[PDB]
Amino acid sequence: MITISTMLQFGLFLIALIGLVIKLIELSNKK
Secondary structure, three states: OOOHHHHHHHHHHHHHHHHHHHHHHHHHOOO
């Protein structure tokens, strides 16, 4: 089930995962 109110939440959830991966990947390429 998808809703407009939850629509933002759904997008946010995916975005958070992307940020985490990007942030995590930073350690791998850390300086």
